[PDB]
Amino acid sequence: AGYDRHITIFSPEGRLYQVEYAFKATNQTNINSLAVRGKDCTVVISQKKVPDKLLDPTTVSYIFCISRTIGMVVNGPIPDARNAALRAKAEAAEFRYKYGYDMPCDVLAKRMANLSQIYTQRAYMRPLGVILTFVSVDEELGPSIYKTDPAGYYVGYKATATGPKQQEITTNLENHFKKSKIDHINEESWEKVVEFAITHMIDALGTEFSKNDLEVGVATKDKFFTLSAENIEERLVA
Amino acid sequence: SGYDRALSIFSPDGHIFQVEYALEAVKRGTCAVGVKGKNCVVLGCERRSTLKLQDTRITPSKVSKIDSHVVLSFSGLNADSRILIEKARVEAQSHRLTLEDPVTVEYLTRYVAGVQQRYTQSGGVRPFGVSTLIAGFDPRDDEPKLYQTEPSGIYSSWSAQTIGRNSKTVREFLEKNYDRKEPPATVEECVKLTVRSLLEVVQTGAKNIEITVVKPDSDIVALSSEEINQYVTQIEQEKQE
Amino acid sequence: LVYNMTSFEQGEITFDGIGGLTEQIRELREVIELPLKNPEIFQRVGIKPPKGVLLYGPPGTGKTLLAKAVAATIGANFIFSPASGIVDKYIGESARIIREMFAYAKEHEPCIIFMDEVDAIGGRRFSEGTSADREIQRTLMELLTQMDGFDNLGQTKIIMATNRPDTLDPALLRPGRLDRKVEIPLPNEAGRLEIFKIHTAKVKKTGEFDFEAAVKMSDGFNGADIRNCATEAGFFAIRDDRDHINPDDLMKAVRKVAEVKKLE
Amino acid sequence: TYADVGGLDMQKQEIREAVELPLVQADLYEQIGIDPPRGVLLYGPPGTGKTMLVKAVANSTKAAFIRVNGSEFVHKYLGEGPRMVRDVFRLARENAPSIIFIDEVDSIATKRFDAQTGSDREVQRILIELLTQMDGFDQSTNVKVIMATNRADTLDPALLRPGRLDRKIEFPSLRDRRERRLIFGTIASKMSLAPEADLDSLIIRNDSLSGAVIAAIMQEAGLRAVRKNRYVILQSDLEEAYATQVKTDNTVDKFDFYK
Amino acid sequence: RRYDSRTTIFSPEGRLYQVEYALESISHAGTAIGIMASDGIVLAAERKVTSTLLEQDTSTEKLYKLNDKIAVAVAGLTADAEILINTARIHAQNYLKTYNEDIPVEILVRRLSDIKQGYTQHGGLRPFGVSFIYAGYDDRYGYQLYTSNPSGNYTGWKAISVGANTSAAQTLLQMDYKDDMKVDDAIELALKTLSKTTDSSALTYDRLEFATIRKGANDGEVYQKIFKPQEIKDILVKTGI
Amino acid sequence: MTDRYSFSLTTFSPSGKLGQIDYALTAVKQGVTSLGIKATNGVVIATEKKSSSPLAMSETLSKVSLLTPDIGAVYSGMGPDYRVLVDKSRKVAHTSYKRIYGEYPPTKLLVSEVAKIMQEATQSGGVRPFGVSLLIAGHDEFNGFSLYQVDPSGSYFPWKATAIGKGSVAAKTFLEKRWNDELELEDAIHIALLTLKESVEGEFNGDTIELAIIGDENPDLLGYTGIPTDKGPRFRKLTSQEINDRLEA
Amino acid sequence: DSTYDMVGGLTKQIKEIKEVIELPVKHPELFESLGIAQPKGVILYGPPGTGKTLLARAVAHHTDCKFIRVSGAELVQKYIGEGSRMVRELFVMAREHAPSIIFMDEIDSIGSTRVEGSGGGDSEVQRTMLELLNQLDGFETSKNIKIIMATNRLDILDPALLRPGRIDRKIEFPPPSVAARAEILRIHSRKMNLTRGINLRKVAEKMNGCSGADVKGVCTEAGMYALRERRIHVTQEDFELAVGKVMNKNQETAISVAKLFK
Ligand SMILES: Nc1ncnc2c1ncn2[C@@H]1O[C@H](COP(=O)(O)OP(=O)(O)OP(=O)(O)O)[C@@H](O)[C@H]1O
Ligand SMILES: Nc1ncnc2c1ncn2[C@@H]1O[C@H](COP(=O)(O)OP(=O)(O)O)[C@@H](O)[C@H]1O
Ligand SMILES: Nc1ncnc2c1ncn2[C@@H]1O[C@H](COP(=O)(O)OP(=O)(O)O)[C@@H](O)[C@H]1O
Helix, strand or coil, X not given: CCCCCCCCCCCCCCCCCHHHHHHHCCXXXXXXXXXXXXXXXXXXXXXXXXXXXXXXXXXXXXXXXXXXXXXXXXXXXXHHHHHHHHHHHHHHHHHHHHHXXXXXXXXXXXXXXXXXXXXXXXXXXXXXXXXXXXXXXXXXXXXXXXXXXXXXXXXXXXXXXXXXXXXXHHHHHHHHXXXXXXXXXXXXXXXXXXXXXXXHHHHHHCCCCCCCCEEEEEEECCEEEEECCCCXXXXXXX | CCCCCCCCCCCXXXXXXXXXXXXXXXXXXXXXCEEECCCCEEEXXXXXXXXXXXXXXXXXXXXXXXXCCEXXXXXXXXXXXXXXXXXXXXXXXXXXXXXXCCCCHHHHHHHHHHHHCHHHHCCCCCCCCEEEEEEEECCCCXXXXXXXXXXXXXXXCCCXXXXXXXXXXXXXXXXXXXXXXXXCCCHHHHHXXXXXXXXXXXXXXXXXXXXXXXXXXXXXXXXXXXXXXXXXXXXXHCCCC | CCCCCCHHHCCCCCCCCCCCCCHHHHHHHHHCHHHHHCHHHXXXXXXXXXXXEEECCCCCCCCCHHHHHHHHHHCCCECCXXXXXXXXXXXXXXXXXXXXXXXXXHHCXXXXXXXXXXXXXXXXXXXCCHHHHHHHHHHHHHXXXXXXXXXXXXXXXXXXXXXXXXXXXXXXXXXXXXXXXECCCCXXXXXXXXXXXXXXXXXXXXXXXXXXXXXHHCCCCCHXXXXXXXXXXXXXXXXXXXXXXXXXXXXHHHHHHCCHHHHC | CCCCCCCCCCHHHHHHHHCHHHXXXXXXXXXXXXXXXXXXXXXXXXXXXXXXHHHHHHHCCCCCCCECCHHHCCCCCCCHHHHHHHHHHHHHHHCCCCCEECXXXXXXXXXXXXXXXXXXXXXXXXXXXHHHHHCCCCCCCCCCEECCECCXXXXXXXXXXXXXXXXXXXXXXXXXXXXXXXXXXXXXXXXXXXXXXXXXXXXXXXXXXXXXXXXXXXXXXXXXXXCCCCCCCCCCCCHHXXXXXXXXXXXXHHCCXXX | CCCCCCCCCCCCCXXXXXXXXXXXXXXXXXXXXXXXXXXXXXXXXXXXXXXXXXXXXCCCCCCCECCCCCEEECCCECHHHHHHHHHHHHHHHHHHHHHCCCCCHHHHHHHHHCCCCCCCCCCCCCCCCCCCEEEEEECCCEEEEEECCCCCCCEEEXXXXXXXXXXHHHHHHHCCCCCCCCCHHHHHHXXXXXXXXXXXXXXXXXXXXXXXXXXXXXXXXXXXXXXXXXXXXXXXXXXXX | CCXXXXXXXXXXXXXXXXXXXXXXXXXXXXXXCEEEXXXXXXXXXXXXXXXCCCCECCCCCCCXXXXXXXXXXXXXXXXXXXXXXXXXXXXXXXXXXXXXXXXXXXXXXXXXXXXXXXXXXXXXXXXXXXXCCEEEEECCCCCCCEEEEECCCCCEEEECEEEECCCCHHHHHXXXXXXXXXXXXXXXXXXXXXXXXXXXXXXXXXXXXXXXXXXXXXXXXXCCCCCCCCCCXXXXXXXXXXXHCHHHX | CCCCCCCCCCCCCHHHHCCCCHHHHHCCHHHHHCCCXXXXXXXXXXXXXXXXXXXXXXXXXXXXXXXEEEXXXXXXXXXXXXXHHHHXXXXXXXXXXXXXXXXXXXXXXXXXXXXXXXXXXXXXXXXXXXXXXXXXXXXXXXXXXXXXXXXXXXXXXXXXXXXXXXXXXXXXXXXXXXXXXXXXXXXXXXXXXXXCCCCCHHHHCCCCCCCCHHHHHHHHHHHHHHHCCCCCCCCCHHHHHHHHHHCXXXXXXXXCCCCCEC
16 A cells, blocks of 8 residues: 555654654564663673684674774674674764764764664655664763664664664663662673673573673773673673 | 557557557647638637636736747647747757857747657656747748648648637638638638638637737737627628528 | 264373473463363352463474363363464355354354464564464454353363464554463473373383483474474484394484484 | 433433324324424444444334444445335334434445446435435435434535435534543442542543543443452553553654655 | 656647646645725635644745735645745845845746756656745735746736635626625625535634735835634624625 | 555646645644744743653753854754754855844744755755754844744745644643733743643653743853844753752742 | 424425326316316425425325325335335226325435446436436326325436426425524424513524424523423523524534634
């Protein structure tokens, strides 16, 4: 009947359908990540699944350190994600060269989301089937999370999640914050925040993990980066 | 079928459709007759008497001259007729500019058809729902002539012709009366020829007509409403019984 | 008989000779067995017994073997009404069938339904052909009134099985009935040998045991997988006219037949 | 019954006089000399408590009574719909004085657009089976009709006039506190609950509600406690219940659809 | 297969069904009236809605302006109406600065209409559904009154109307009109029609607005007067609603 | 039950209406409520927010936005077709009016520009409109205060007091019964809340809303002091603590 | 049954009905002397609640001929090719009684315009009554049979039905004028009571042309606002109360602020 094979057609009840399919096309990986702030930092974890035994696991990654003091963790299939991470690695030249200093995260989500808005008014491109999560350590407002989406409803969560297990993680997280009545997490050490995060989520869904089945990102001030299999026993050491 | 909803496809009989559907639009319009005597041309119209709220100070006018030795008449729909009239008179005054010489009538007539050929060929475009005809004299000669044009983009040279409602009654009529065995000479018989030709349509209303004629030496002359009203009567004067 | 088996209330398949769950099956123990067992409380509170349930999830879970099985414990009549096999192109006659069965169920004293693939009822209506979609609600809406009208019985229970939950959003039909909506599982790796212990029985096979089976059963977590592996692993000991299974055929079976159970 | 219904302090009155009073007291209508009415119509959104009121009237009418929901009319073989409809009104006048109930007509009672089909054209003449009966050459003085619908602004005006529907009635919205306090007291009082009775803590909330959701919350709250190997009473920790009656959160198309 | 999905298609019956489906849009719009008479032209209006919490008091809707000479009345869509007048207000000034005098009203509409024809064929685009009225004064033709049509054909009328139920309003104008009216014969006429063919019985001052052209400039050109409410609520009570 | 003409937006039906602009407005309803009132000295704007996940920092988003120091806006409808609309708007305030007339626009010559951003959507096919309907409030020295509305069809009204979104017909009924033509400012705020009470769910505090006003000069916001006539804004939005106390009455 | 004193509201229409009906029956000799034609049946269109069916039950009370009725869609039938049989077995029952009026209240169920994608037996039985009225043997049937049909809006139908030769008149039943609306009050009121110091034209002029049947609703309802209080008699202010009310809700959903235009 139409109404579905095109983007720019409203249904008579108001809701269009094609983006809603893309909102649903994120979780073809069966992956679920997690982000959480600190006192001066922020961290992001990411589940891994490399079932076949011929992939150099070092290069498979849904992480893209776009520049200094910025990070990003994606859902949706990988190829669309590279097609977004590139544009991020392009603007951070421009905003620096054009306006002088480095991009804050909030703008970088605001800018990027307008681009995926413009692909809900015309058939230039299809909309990317991604929903991606930037992190940083701001020079003014401090650590920050922002949760983009295809259509372009970005917001700043204090500590959020994604994947097919959002309802569950949505349950236990907010239970934690009300046991202390605080948005962020204390205990400065970005190291020790990992031990907080991972144990908060193994018990959430209920499965123990190895070192060769996760990847993590850490957001200190002055730099963002990734880490290999160091610090993979203190969660059970004590 | 589906072969008739565009301009860039052929039916299996070989003929396109959106063009000759225009010939059904022009059939829905008013008459437009023309005749050439030995040394003078005439032109008619099936003007309407619609209602008593159009300003008598400005009667409408199918006819519209483009230069002092050429005129034009049409039928179909007026909006798409307004354009090529303005692309015509523009083109003529350019030919006076570039060449220091007025227009041969044949050159003009191939410009209006030279647009009715592109406005059907290249899609993204609708044709001109109008047929027209040209009338006048070449410079420096008395050679009379009128040319017809139609949205397929072809130009002919009739000696007498009509377009629109009950044209079929008329184009057979003048064949029964007009003929090259005896070409008329001056105005009062070319007009006495024509004013009777309209009568298949006019149903005896003389507030429903206008008329013009043609001069040599780049002139024209219009005509009045009583200056036909007598000609309404000499043509009826024969109709005693 | 005309339509369905009805199980004569006693054909006693084992609801526990199965590698399913204990929590869910005990969640169902509430809504069915407790009143029919123990009306002294719902009476004491005056609440009417419950109105049906949904069991989402895709197959392999055994979301129909438990149903008739627990029905066999209590002893009601188990039937079908697959909505894929209920639709009829004519204007009515999709609702007539609904009207027959609520009546014909009551022709029997107890009776319980097993609808399946009920998304055929609950469609998004993206086509919006009003000659059709005006009727799709017409037969659907008749269900809503045929199901809970004057029927004050404690025998006529309802079930609806619906793979692909939440595909329906013309109406979620939430308020009132559907007193449970069970959070269905999939077969966990622990449950594999809980399941393989089921079908392996009634065999003389020199054991045919292994811990290399859940790894083989990883991602092939559907009950048909185990039913069929025990099938074809049974067909390989006879491939050479042997006398008893070897567990390598199991390590061969699930490894080499979950292929179709993972690609298509 | 009536006493089983809660806050219909207004609506309850109009039909128990438009139905019961005539057959018990009609000589006084004509003691003026007028013809009384024949049809009514009950339009309000679902759960507002309409289909059950007639069931109260069913218990107390001392007349006949007929139940036909609008989907029951149609069949595949045309022509039989109307004769079924004709079979109704003849049955009524036979077992007179009688009345009729319908629980939904929006599948029928519509605007009568310009049809170009068989489906959309055959539904219409069903509706015509009503009009030629309710006012034609052959009419009577014993039948009355109780229509129904979840909403009434589309069904054709030719059905909506006097002679047909002399008295149609509205229903409340879902945000009107007075009756809400009246329902919880009604339903809860029909059975035994706790002394710790925080029901004057729930009414005050801004949320919109029906008479249907209330049957859900107070039942499924009666579920969780009876499920607790308990006997009667419902604990004041039914805060699960009210928040469990938040279906907007359970609508992803009301969560991640338009944006 | 019926011939309406695009406006670049003649029908086999010889017609363009999309354009008729635009000329019917104005029927949804609000009434507009103009009368031509001795002293100067008058116009009227009727707002489609007359509710409470929106001010139609200082905010004119149906009566924009194009120059101190010329003023119009508007109907139809609103988004496809502003851009026309925001073109007309340009073309006039771009006729002034080059020729150092004012505009003749005939050229404007001739230039404002032939663009609507442009949005009829060349492209798969909407035709602007609007039915302006033109009111103004030029020296070569004196007082003037034209009318448009989203096809692109105009007409020089004496006193006509458009919008809801004009077909009846004309009948209330055809027979009870006199050319020698000065001003107020047209006023009590005009305001009597809208009183007859309305939707509701209010006729409140907010519901309608007037305007005027007048040659009362004693050898100066012309004046306008777009009436505030205090000049039109006092006149209808001064006229006998 | 519509067919064959809502498919696009460039085919007039025989009835004589365009296809899906009528259906864009259907979402405008399904968005959250909104309102705005014209006083004799100021204008107000207000919306709630049903923030889906409470973990969201609701302060980051802002229903209300800036256009000038003197003009402000709000929608009732789709979100992401707003936060781009404003940058496409205030970019026009500069290049169109300011840099060729020196100073900032009035409201209507800033609203008329918004429309020409809108109608450029409904010009062709397969290019949708904006799923929003706005209202604008501002002030000038020529005619003073005004309260306008903007629809996706390019049209733009004026108003005096209005609501839109879900609680549109219900609210606008109440406003007709709780309004005067010669009232003051502060009572207007005492209306909008209890108007906003009409179609509220969840909480009602100052955290779960955002409302703004306009009025007399607020030169404390200026920061560039030392000039006689370089006067400061007529715009400021009210803090939750500045609202949560007003709610106490 | 009802009578002509009760169908007040007009005379021009009803004075055109027996222009075709009563005259040929009683007095065809002048019309055979004049000897020109025989004008057959009639159609009467109008909005609902106007008195269409009412005139058709009265006329039977004042006819002296036989008056056959078919209500809405009792000719469309399940099996095939007997709907026609249900028709041609009708008219043969008429000609037994040579003066025979028939009546069919509504035709928009049957006589709607034809298409091919759908509409079967109904578009067939219409395609033989259309024969019976003006065919060879229809010329025989054309002698004395007369027809009345009462649609609601006629643009739907074919022209062949309302084509003359068989439909010689097409009457309009529009909603009335003030005095027409004013009288039928009395025709629905005279039973009532010694109504006390009352006018009824000042209230009709309040209610502009809505319909006729609505007026039967205000009067019956007005007594009901007096019936509750055991106030057997009737008031004035109860009337302009009710008529001001029952049309309000009819003027309630007419509003809309879409306004994509002007
Ligand atoms: N002018 C009138 N005189 C007498 N009764 C009237 C008049 N107008 C309306 N009525 C009343 O209205 C009803 C008749 O409605 P009407 O006949 O106009 O509709 P209808 O033609 O029966 O509708 P349909 O035939 O399409 O079903 C009767 O109850 C009648 O008393
Ligand atoms: N938990 C289980 N344990 C053992 N076998 C199972 C289990 N679930 C399903 N099965 C097998 O799968 C079959 C049931 O298929 P099922 O998944 O119920 O189909 P559907 O989901 O369409 O009802 C049974 O015959 C059984 O052998
Ligand atoms: N006042 C009330 N008290 C108790 N239950 C009510 C009340 N009003 C409505 N209900 C519930 O709502 C249901 C009726 O829904 P309803 O709106 O009548 O749907 P429909 O009209 O389509 O049948 C009943 O089953 C009843 O349990």
